[PDB]
Write a protein that binds this ligand. Structure first.
Ligand SMILES: CC(C)(COP(=O)(O)OP(=O)(O)OC[C@H]1O[C@@H](n2cnc3c(N)ncnc32)[C@H](O)[C@@H]1OP(=O)(O)O)[C@@H](O)C(=O)NCCC(=O)NCCSC(=O)CCC(=O)O
Ligand SMILES: CC(C)(COP(=O)(O)OP(=O)(O)OC[C@H]1O[C@@H](n2cnc3c(N)ncnc32)[C@H](O)[C@@H]1OP(=O)(O)O)[C@@H](O)C(=O)NCCC(=O)NCCSC(=O)CCC(=O)O
Ligand SMILES: CC(C)(COP(=O)(O)OP(=O)(O)OC[C@H]1O[C@@H](n2cnc3c(N)ncnc32)[C@H](O)[C@@H]1OP(=O)(O)O)[C@@H](O)C(=O)NCCC(=O)NCCSC(=O)CCC(=O)O
Ligand SMILES: O=C(O)CCCCCC(=O)O
Ligand SMILES: O=C(O)CCCCCC(=O)O
Ligand SMILES: O=C(O)CCCCCC(=O)O
Lengths: 274, 274, 274
């Protein structure tokens, strides 16, 4: 949308000099518009096109700028109080709205405005940061975190204590992406624009960043940055040349199967009743 | 209790066809009764009998059915709002009740109805899911999670970020059980009906599921599914046949002792003052 | 401050016999004063002097005693309720105060009274326990935990799901300390009075306690209890004498550099706008 994209990459340029006071209602209204698009899935930080994921860097820019253009305001907690600049997504909703939007929100699950939550999802108590996208049928288990701009596919299981890297701090080039039908094991972490291809299964306590060797015991091939579709990954270590010690790595132990499928399936009864 | 057990395994059968509208007050009232029993420790998903743990599969069924029989309702958060079908355990309590019930609840700790919290326990901010049982003197540290139906013994220390596997999603046969006097290290995960025998000490960052080899460097014996009473467990790796790489495992490095005891003890001063 | 220090080590002595009812307003008022000092950074559990960190054991004592001298009171959550004895730090604040105090508090971030939060910090939803100190420019990412009495330096990045060991349960001699300009990777844990020297980078899923070997592949030197300033640490394993298995350890793979710096930097735009 040029009418927005234009006013946005304009200000980004002066990012360090804009402030909640010296900013022009022009740029203010836009960033506000661009944020509202993201909040509704109408727009999205990243997308797959021609079998390639592509980042809309300028939408990341709008997210960054929301922080320069808005001011902190006190939020009345019950027993305590908050002071921040990003509104609560679900604060205006009524039952009607929740009813039509079709996902479930378990307290005290929390979502920031500018994040997209699809139909038939379940948010156990967790966190969804600004500009992120969570597709249909997905579950975000307890204490899990969907980082700023992260892309979550359909029917994905993010187990408890799972973290999906953002792009705000530390600043990142690309968002983290989990393709459809992936299962992420408890307390695992996926960061730095790593891509998990669809139908993959990451075990518990597995940590993947750009420096993580993803080793295929079968091929002897070592990957970096992505998990080939349909893989089952678990933690391991590779040894030093002198065999003096070993360092962490992610090992692809096999391709997903019936046995694997029996342990990682989604529970439809937990989903929205039509 | 046949009068309940009967009406329950009846509906479970038609699980996918019951809904918050087409359900008969008969089945509704029961599931509601069976849930209230669990909420009070009067009933419990699993129990030890003749030195064996036994699952009451039909009580798991009632838990599953609570999700088909009830409807989501909006929950008024302070700064935000929720939409879910399982009530907050502590929402009706007054000081009187808390006073007699004898445990401590640190905000923003959250418990679902149908979960049993014993006397003299301490809940740092954490999560206790439906149908779970937490015995006396136990502490659940910050961001820890007690999964649906999990069984937690007396005087147990679940450190920060510790996760205890549930049985809802992914669907499990047996609950996860931690026997009395066990200490679980920070950020560790115990899932898939694995049993931790009493007085055991699991270090930090240890992950145990049914596929996890629990290795005894002493005996050379490898366990699966349970931690022998009085063990001290830490993370390790076992090597491949060709020595080309190594995979994660849980190593039993020793039996608990004075040295160990000095690091994992409970702090009575933190407990309820009589 | 002798006038306080005196009345404090007096009662600590009778710790198990004091109670919220049999305690003298003298000792009550003090502990209350000593707690208020800590809440304001005026006092602090530990400090560096002559290039050595030193614990004020008697201030730890006051923290312990706050638990014997105060009584639990019900806290009104919105949808639920709490029962605890330590007040919410930010419950009395108004915008004016937040404005002058200069940090940001993202809901549902929670801080206990008696904890020091510096200027220009950012608390994503997380936990800061009593008696802890968080210095300037620091960020505490989502679901992170700053344990009781822990010391956090300036410009530190505690990533998501990171845990910093406390001293309450299990009872500890010294607090955990993170020096200035340190970066802690996602889901990592630092406990038992271990010290991380300034400008160090700990990767993801790294767990450090007193029994953790911190191995320097370069020197062959093994550390215990501290991370030498400017180190980059990642998980690994060291092998058994018979090569029968391997056990977890923290490996110092290199000294921090430009490459490293590009991945772990702070985002000023996220900080307080002057
Ligand atoms: C990845 C799987 C599913 C294992 O795959 P499968 O069962 O299909 O395979 P398998 O035949 O058992 O394993 C094949 C090879 O992989 C190895 N292997 C598999 N999983 C392993 C693991 N976790 N650790 C070590 N090795 C593992 C086997 O040893 C074997 O060795 P060889 O091939 O050499 O012989 C499991 O380990 C896993 O990650 N489960 C996830 C559990 C989880 O995180 N649940 C969410 C809980 S959280 C929740 O529900 C609520 C509570 C909470 O919030 O915490
Ligand atoms: C398991 C223990 C207690 C260690 O047992 P001990 O101290 O009795 O034994 P030890 O003599 O030191 O160790 C015996 C053998 O086990 C090995 N060993 C022991 N612990 C190890 C560990 N974590 N990593 C690697 N190896 C370890 C030793 O190297 C040694 O090797 P050899 O036998 O071959 O010579 C410790 O490692 C541990 O797990 N501590 C838990 C800390 C924790 O999680 N605290 C909660 C923080 S959470 C909190 O309080 C609030 C903050 C928050 O919420 O995060
Ligand atoms: C430590 C670093 C920064 C890596 O250091 P560098 O990039 O400078 O070094 P490098 O050249 O890539 O690595 C040098 C040596 O260290 C090894 N190495 C480095 N990092 C490693 C890792 N994580 N695992 C295994 N090995 C690793 C290399 O293999 C290499 O081997 P050789 O030397 O032998 O060749 C990275 O691994 C890391 O920890 N990143 C942190 C990401 C993170 O936690 N972000 C926060 C996400 S949380 C968030 O933002 C919101 C979402 C949420 O809340 O979860
Ligand atoms: O400052 C904020 O409000 C957001 C910080 C997010 C830190 C992790 C991320 O990059 O998502
Ligand atoms: O749908 C819910 O409300 C509960 C899901 C729980 C997921 C983990 C478990 O099996 O405990
Ligand atoms: O009882 C409490 O309120 C605090 C317990 C803290 C447990 C972990 C720590 O030592 O910080």
């Amino acid at each position: 949308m040029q009418q927005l994209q234009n006013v946005i990459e304009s200000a980004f340029e002066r990012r360090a000099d804009i402030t909640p006071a010296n900013v022009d209602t022009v740029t203010r209204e836009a960033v506000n518009q661009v944020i509202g698009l993201l909040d509704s899935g109408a727009l999205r930080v990243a997308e797959k096109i021609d079998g390639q994921w592509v980042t809309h860097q300028w939408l990341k820019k709008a997210v960054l700028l929301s922080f320069r253009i808005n001011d902190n305001k006190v939020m009345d907690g019950a027993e305590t109080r908050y002071y921040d600049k990003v509104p609560m997504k679900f604060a205006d909703y009524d039952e009607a709205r929740f009813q039509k939007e079709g996902f479930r929100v378990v307290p005290p699950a929390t979502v920031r405005q500018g994040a997209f939550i699809a139909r038939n999802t379940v948010l156990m108590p967790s966190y969804v940061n600004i500009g992120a996208y969570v597709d249909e049928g997905t579950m975000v288990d307890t204490w899990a975190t969907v980082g700023s701009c992260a892309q979550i596919g359909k029917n994905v299981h993010l187990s408890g204590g799972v973290g999906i890297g953002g792009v705000l701090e530390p600043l990142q080039a690309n968002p983290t992406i989990i393709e459809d039908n992936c299962f992420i094991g408890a307390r695992s972490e996926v960061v730095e624009g790593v891509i998990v291809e669809e139908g993959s299964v990451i075990s518990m306590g597995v940590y993947l960043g750009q420096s993580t060797r993803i080793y295929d015991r079968e091929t002897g091939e070592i990957h970096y940055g992505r998990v080939p579709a349909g893989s089952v990954v678990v933690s391991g270590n590779l040894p030093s040349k002198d065999g003096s010690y070993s360092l962490y790595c992610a090992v692809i132990v096999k391709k997903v199967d019936a046995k694997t499928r029996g342990k990682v399936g989604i529970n439809e009864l937990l989903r929205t009743i039509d």
